[PDB]
């Protein structure tokens, strides 16, 4: 398939758009993890729950520093 | 616009055609003709390598007309 891979290039293009959005906002997230988050909202999820998850997980790496 | 840009390339192509005709009439004495065409031939040896490298980049595109003509500006000036 050829059109099914140009859509994957399209996914990477929006992923770089969200890369610029992540740096101007100063988030710690990288590209692989945001693709995991994209799949999470494919199944449907509260962003308020994902932010509480990540707002526990990042400042539970500051408790073993 | 096409008719003009290929015309400019044609005006340069006359100057290469005249020289190649002059070279062909030596291998197809004055005692300086051979010593002069030797340096001319060496010039073509360098110049052709530069041009074939551009063609090597064509086999491997993003190159348009406006890239190679600006690249070859200091050579087509030297041709005149």
């Amino acid at each position: 398939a050829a059109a099914a891979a140009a859509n994957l290039n399209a996914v990477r293009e929006t992923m770089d758009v969200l890369l610029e959005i992540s740096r101007i906002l100063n988030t710690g997230l990288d590209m692989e993890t945001l693709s995991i988050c994209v799949r999470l909202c494919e199944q449907g999820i509260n962003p308020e729950a994902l932010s509480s998850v990540i707002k526990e997980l990042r400042k539970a790496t500051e408790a073993l520093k | 616009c096409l008719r003009s840009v290929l015309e400019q390339i044609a005006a340069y192509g006359q100057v290469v055609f005249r020289l190649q005709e002059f070279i062909d009439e030596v291998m197809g004495p004055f005692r300086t003709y051979q010593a002069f065409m030797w340096a001319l031939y060496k010039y073509f040896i360098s110049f052709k390598e530069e041009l074939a490298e551009i063609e090597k980049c064509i086999i491997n595109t993003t190159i348009t007309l406006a890239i190679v003509v600006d690249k070859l500006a200091p050579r087509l000036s030297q041709l005149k």
Binding site: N7, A10, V11, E13, T14, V17, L18, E20, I21, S22, I24, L25, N26, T27, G28, L29, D30, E32, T33, L34, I36, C37, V38, R39, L40, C41, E42, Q43, G44, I45, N46, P47, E48, A49, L50, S51, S52, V53, I54, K55, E56, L57, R58, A60, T61, L64 | -
Partner: protein
Amino acid sequence: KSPNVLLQNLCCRILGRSEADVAQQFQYAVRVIGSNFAPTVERDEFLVAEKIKKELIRQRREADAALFSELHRKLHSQGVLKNKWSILYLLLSLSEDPRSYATLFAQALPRDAHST
């Protein structure tokens, strides 16, 4: 995949330690994902786009707000994401400022004059 197996890879990206070394924060993740799963306000990416503009004026930059506008247009032009509101609200929630009033601020529809 499925959400229960998806959270453990988050625990390996954000934390550097394995999911067999720590489970307590994985347990908090399970606890908050289980109990409530659906939003309490309505969605639209237009409103959070106008709120991302409000955040970018707030950090005393003004050029990147015109950057975000062409970027948010590209988000529409491609159209591969199923819910575009959630990830933009999500990046909005994790904002950081390097460097009054908050009871006026533009909010969502309350859903108190709304029944599904």
